[PDB]
Amino acid sequence: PTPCYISIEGQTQGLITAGACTADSIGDSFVEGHEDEMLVQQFDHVVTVPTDPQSGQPSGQRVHKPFKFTVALNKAVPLLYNALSSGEKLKTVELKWYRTSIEGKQENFFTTKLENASIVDIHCEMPHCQDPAKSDFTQNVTVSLSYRKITWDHVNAGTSGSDDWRKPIE
Amino acid sequence: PTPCYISIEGQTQGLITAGACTADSIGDSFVEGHEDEMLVQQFDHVVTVPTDPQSGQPSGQRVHKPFKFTVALNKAVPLLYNALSSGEKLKTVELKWYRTSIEGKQENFFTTKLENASIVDIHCEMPHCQDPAKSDFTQNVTVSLSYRKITWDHVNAGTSGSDDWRKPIE
Amino acid sequence: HNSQFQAMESAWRGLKLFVDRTDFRENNKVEILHVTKDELLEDFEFAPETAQSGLYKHVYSAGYGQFGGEPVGAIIGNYAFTPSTPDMKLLQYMGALGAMAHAPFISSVGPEFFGIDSFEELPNIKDLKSTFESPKYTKWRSLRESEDARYLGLTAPRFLLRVPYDPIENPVKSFNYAENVSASHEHYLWGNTAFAFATRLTDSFAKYRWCPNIIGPQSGGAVEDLPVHVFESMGALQSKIPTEVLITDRKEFELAEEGFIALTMRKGSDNAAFFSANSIQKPKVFPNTKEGKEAETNYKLGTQLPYMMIINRLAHYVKVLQREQIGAWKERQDLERELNSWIKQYVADQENPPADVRSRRPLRAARIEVMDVEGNPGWYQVSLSVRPHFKYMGANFELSLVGRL
Amino acid sequence: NAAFFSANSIQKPKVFPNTKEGKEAETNYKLGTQLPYMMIINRLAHYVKVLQREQIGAWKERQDLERE
Amino acid sequence: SKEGSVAPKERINIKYIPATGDAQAEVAEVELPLKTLVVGDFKGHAEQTPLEERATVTVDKNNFEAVMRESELKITATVKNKLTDDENAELPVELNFKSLADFAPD
């Protein structure tokens, strides 16, 4: 799978990922043109709806389980440990799913934007240095995001979903 | 195992999967003739009945644990995140189990249709991009479905089961 | 109340009603051209071809046909059209101008267009379909069948501009002025409704940055805040109607089939509404084949004119966007991609999106097929094939009683 | 009590022409005159003079000079 | 226009001269405003210049008072005299309009 890109903008800390793919953040694995966007490796996201038994109807509104995106240690990680430990909301988070098209060029076929989105938890780990099976990995900083409003958006087919606590559907 | 196909029709959003196997949805892995049907990879579905101990009799009516079918990110996935987050029922979901017959042609030997069926949860994930064991995978969007009425139907032998909350057996 | 003053007051205070309503902060500009209506046909008689006229210089070349210049959305005609030959020759030369610069020419017909010579006897017309099938209108029914008539809408009756003054309601400084309006309703400052219909072209653009939203009494075709004049009738206290006739629903539907943008007035208040912005083009009856029954519904969508305005913008954006690119290093595959990734921010291929996704993204599906030109290689016949969403017009509601259910 | 509000030195902000770089370098040259900002680079002339005085005679490189 | 510097030497010679800067001129895709052209008789005569030479003026809410003043809408007509006991008397007027309040009877 191809890695995605996330651009986080905080309430008070401005654009958090501004510079999270320079040569100072991640060494020689930075990408030109994506200077304001982290490099997201793994992803996971659940949106449940409590339904009653012995029926099919939704017995309650949706419950957003958090984002789980994984980036390496870089410039934006000390900035994301103040959005976490102080409960600062983040004005936007624009994940962009890339894929390799037919003509041979990367393109975002799917973007999941995000409105006011605090960070629930951040799971910084490093695999065992003695272990040769996990030698290619560097670090794993899995930043979670609960969120008010999320907008899925498929670009190459124009569809767009949306959920919002602020404006539920009438 | 051979992949199945699912055609979802919503209450207000019409035919949801209309176009979920075009060239805009999934690139070059689309299939002609299945233009209205997603491509379902994995499947899982439990139907429990609470039985009492120290006996054998069913102590209560059946309890439908949800569908779990897995498709890639495509056109219908932002449409399925509004059936989820707003509790919209889906008028039908027609899974079709294919298999390779003796003469050499694909055929549905088993279809599990479905009446009014909300979405319980959707588990969008992407495997780790550094990991070479999971390089062939693209994404995994596991859409669940609680449901009012389900009708199993084996086509090549004509048998047909059915369950319904609306019309239990007298 | 003079014919030189009032005709030059309604043509100028009616502009102020077009300046005050349209939000110029939300990316709107309006050009003002001094012609006279008799000069303009002479100016089309001036050039041997419409592509060398003097109005073609100000509509096409100074605007749209210009590197970096802002292109022209629509032409407000501040005119009073007759069905005579010096006014069907003008519209033949304005439909051809509107098909070159992709901008429909909106103006109005007069009282004498319907053959009544005094306007308030319009609901007395008991059959308006047979009036248009008269031999006086041979240069009208041949204009309607023409292909370039798609860019010609002709608007409403008229509308009121100035409340007559009063020493209590609307006073004047150091004077008491009671404007004695007689039984002649020509003394009211009646404006031209090409002002008021272009108010809805622009107040739809200031909200959604497009314009299909012009035909709704609650959806963007409601000319609000009209002037009213409460005067004493024969015993009762009534209000002067801000449009000069009360257009019924059957009269407006008969004007809708015959190519008119009528303005029904909300009887008893200061509001009005458009219901159908159909251009003067006629839906051509195609034969009863599989493609003929299809292409009849395809050709019907061309004439209706909210749908032209979502592809006139797809002639003004795409002219500008592919003007910067001349001299680049591109390919046919690169030409397919710079257009498909561009228009799919205007496409919401979705059966029921929310009410904001429908109007920010007015299209529904778009096909782009880039081909080549052999002989001189590097010339690209692409075919952008957009498709719109569909609004709400007419139903049946066939009531009954069941008794048990 | 009393208060200072602006520690501007006597230098005048030179008006640069209205180009892209001229409108930029005018705001760049304005930061030189203000003098709290000189005192955060006068210290970056006093530390760096002292710190690269001890180093004379070492075994260094250009890549080592970039890193120190 | 000379920075005060020291004599060069084996010691290091720090000087402060501000640099030219790097702008890298930023892209800005401005959009097309919905421009309309209101055409029609706006004065009280027929101008003798042909159409291809006269100009179009841009009007918004802030400059409408300046477009009206520079047009010089001079309406000269003969109207009926109702200031005396004569019914068959006429009285020409002379009007000079510079603001929207010049339409008012004050």
PDB file of C-alpha atoms in Angstrom, chain B residues 1 6 12 18 21 28 34 41 49 51 54 58 61 70 72-73 97 106 110-111 125 133 136 151 154 156 159 165:
ATOM      1  CA  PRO B   1     -11.754 -18.677  -2.562  1.00  0.00           C
ATOM      2  CA  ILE B   6     -22.641  -6.974  -3.151  1.00  0.00           C
ATOM      3  CA  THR B  12     -32.628   7.901   0.190  1.00  0.00           C
ATOM      4  CA  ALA B  18     -23.989   2.071  -8.779  1.00  0.00           C
ATOM      5  CA  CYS B  21     -16.599  -1.101 -10.142  1.00  0.00           C
ATOM      6  CA  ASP B  28      -7.816  -1.167 -13.481  1.00  0.00           C
ATOM      7  CA  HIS B  34     -20.526  -5.947 -12.486  1.00  0.00           C
ATOM      8  CA  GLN B  41     -12.980  -9.970  -0.371  1.00  0.00           C
ATOM      9  CA  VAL B  49     -29.675 -18.512  19.565  1.00  0.00           C
ATOM     10  CA  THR B  51     -30.163 -21.796  24.728  1.00  0.00           C
ATOM     11  CA  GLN B  54     -28.958 -28.358  31.510  1.00  0.00           C
ATOM     12  CA  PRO B  58     -33.830 -22.584  22.754  1.00  0.00           C
ATOM     13  CA  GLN B  61     -35.423 -15.985  19.866  1.00  0.00           C
ATOM     14  CA  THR B  70     -14.524  -6.313   3.202  1.00  0.00           C
ATOM     15  CA  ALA B  72     -11.413  -1.730  -0.941  1.00  0.00           C
ATOM     16  CA  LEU B  73     -11.749   2.048  -0.949  1.00  0.00           C
ATOM     17  CA  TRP B  97     -21.165 -16.191  -3.800  1.00  0.00           C
ATOM     18  CA  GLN B 106     -18.324 -18.426 -12.941  1.00  0.00           C
ATOM     19  CA  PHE B 110     -25.493 -19.150  -3.218  1.00  0.00           C
ATOM     20  CA  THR B 111     -27.024 -15.714  -2.649  1.00  0.00           C
ATOM     21  CA  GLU B 125      -7.719   0.327   7.840  1.00  0.00           C
ATOM     22  CA  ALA B 133       4.505  -9.215   4.067  1.00  0.00           C
ATOM     23  CA  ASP B 136      -0.117  -6.886  -1.976  1.00  0.00           C
ATOM     24  CA  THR B 151     -32.912 -14.780   2.960  1.00  0.00           C
ATOM     25  CA  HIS B 154     -28.783 -21.743  -2.794  1.00  0.00           C
ATOM     26  CA  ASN B 156     -27.918 -24.654  -8.007  1.00  0.00           C
ATOM     27  CA  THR B 159     -33.070 -24.502  -1.362  1.00  0.00           C
ATOM     28  CA  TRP B 165     -38.362 -10.088  12.465  1.00  0.00           C
TER      29      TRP B 165
END
